[PDB]
Write a protein that binds this ligand. Structure first.
Ligand SMILES: Cc1ccncc1NC(=O)Cc1cc(Cl)cc(NCC(C)(C)C#N)c1
Ligand SMILES: Cc1ccncc1NC(=O)Cc1cc(Cl)cc(NCC(C)(C)C#N)c1
Lengths: 304, 304
């Protein structure tokens, strides 16, 4: 028992991290097979970031201008191309530690682990979620760009995020591994305000099921509700609308605990209306929304 | 910017995890050089756990009764010995992935990463602290025994914890890598109640400095206090006493932010007395105590 914000083991991804330098800019790259992927803004000076024309800036760079170092050894760059907001640097050596992998584009509410890196070296691993406004609340400093987000299914790493920037508000933005930003963000030093960061309802419900499974049951009430009644309350509290697809996804947790999804919705409705009254659930004084229903099942069953 | 509960990258430790089976009991082991370390209760049946005499049970086991599998390959056991509550299984092959390592015994309040494993396979990584009552609040299921806790300093892994059991109250107990339990716990199915789980004051203060560094400043007040006055309040709120050694350890964070340690103590005193009033600090509605001052410096400076 116990329930922790758990990240995937990071070894398979540590084996892919490299340092990429272009001129005076250094950041991280992801080396898979004979390609290193990195944010295209590696070609920019800080002055370029104000109004960059990436195609024009890229014309001034040749393969030898991209310095890629894996551990303490240099990789030879034999090609380069830009795909949306990422650069793909073809190297002459396949990464011998390339795991089985896929590139996936996640939806808001989905969680993933981040391996925060600097200079191609791992600093730490944490778990987060793609927020409903397409930002992530990470822990990243200058030089962390190119650090990646991923999920693992047994031996296959699904890369879903590459870090590109911090918005003026201190939240983070990035792309999938095809170089497409999540949300409306652009890799430019311009006004980019984020939309409403709503609470991921289906994940809160999953976490209340995790709380019941782990014996924290005080919040269970004698009520039920309907999807429409619950959603009226969810809207008022800036929670995402709960759909029948979300109810279906919670079916395994409902079956495990014997608590109908709509009864748990009624317990969540009361928590929103009454507050916590100084109590905690799974050691939190707020309702946690960065565990998906699959995360709860995975952690509560010991998937490896 | 941003501040996350961050674990160390787990790759170096994933390379050390093996499965150990004795009879019908399977758990995890840690393979370093030519020794596999695991909880001694691998020799017990569930019935044995009620009143085990480990020396007597161990007499009935030979080297061939310990099955050690690393990946999908069997290791040959050429010796076995019990050291306190751990077994050391000498194998004929040194682990080729053995990192630079040390065995350390940590003090309450110190944090470490756990690589939760099942059947010698990694499931996830999370960060936790040795509680002042010598328990850890982990996420562990049956079969997780032998999973380890560690810290990393560049390329040296300091192992500090090996998981042995879950107390009847759902909190966790284990040993250092010499097999000595943290706290008064024993590897027996008997009454073992934990003492007061007090809040680690020096870590809360570190985290309030992290909050200031990351721009969450609302809780800073116009007051100061003394160690003795602060400790009167800390005692009332089940917080650990703050010592001058703790003040000294917070000196780098005090210097970075320009906030005297005793002024931050006065802000914490007001938070304890007034509550949060529905506000959050670093996305938490409670005061977080599982970041040490070194963790805050490490995360805020991007150490790799
Ligand atoms: C600084 C940081 C922190 C966390 N995550 C990521 C990052 N880095 C970024 O955001 C990349 C970036 C993007 C834009 Cl639009 C401008 C710049 N300018 C350069 C500098 C003035 C040093 C800064 N900041 C750099
Ligand atoms: C179950 C678990 C969960 C989390 N962390 C660790 C563990 N496992 C343990 O505590 C090991 C342990 C120690 C004692 Cl004193 C007795 C037993 N009995 C066996 C069984 C009835 C299956 C159970 N439980 C097993």
């Amino acid at each position: 028992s116990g329930f922790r914000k758990m990240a995937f083991p990071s070894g398979k991804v540590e084996g892919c991290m490299v340092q990429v330098t272009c001129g005076t800019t250094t950041l991280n790259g992801l080396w898979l097979d004979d390609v290193v992927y990195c944010p295209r803004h590696v070609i920019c000076t800080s002055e370029d970031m104000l109004n960059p024309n990436y195609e024009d800036l890229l014309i001034r760079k040749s393969n030898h201008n991209f310095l890629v170092q894996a551990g303490n050894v240099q990789l030879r760059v034999i090609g380069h191309s830009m795909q949306n907001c990422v650069l793909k640097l073809k190297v002459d050596t396949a990464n011998p530690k390339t795991p089985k992998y896929k590139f996936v584009r996640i939806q808001p509410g989905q969680t993933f682990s981040v391996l925060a890196c600097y200079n191609g070296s791992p600093s730490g691993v944490y778990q987060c979620a793609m927020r409903p406004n397409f930002t992530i609340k990470g822990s990243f400093l200058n030089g962390s760009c190119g650090s990646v987000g991923f999920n693992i299914d047994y031996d296959c790493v699904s890369f879903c995020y590459m870090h590109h920037m911090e918005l003026p508000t201190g939240v983070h933005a990035g792309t999938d591994l095809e170089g497409n930003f999540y949300g409306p963000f652009v890799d430019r030093q311009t006004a980019q305000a984020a939309g409403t960061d709503t609470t991921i309802t289906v994940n809160v419900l999953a976490w209340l099921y995790a709380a019941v499974i782990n014996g924290d049951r005080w919040f269970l009430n004698r009520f039920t509700t309907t999807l429409n009644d619950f959603n009226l309350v969810a809207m008022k509290y800036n929670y995402e609308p709960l759909t029948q697809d979300h109810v279906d996804i919670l079916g395994p947790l409902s079956a495990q605990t014997g608590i109908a999804v709509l009864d748990m919705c009624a317990s969540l409705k009361e928590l929103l209306q009454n507050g916590m009254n100084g109590r905690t659930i799974l050691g939190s004084a707020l309702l946690e929304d960065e565990f998906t229903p699959f995360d709860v099942v995975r952690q509560c069953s010991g998937v490896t």
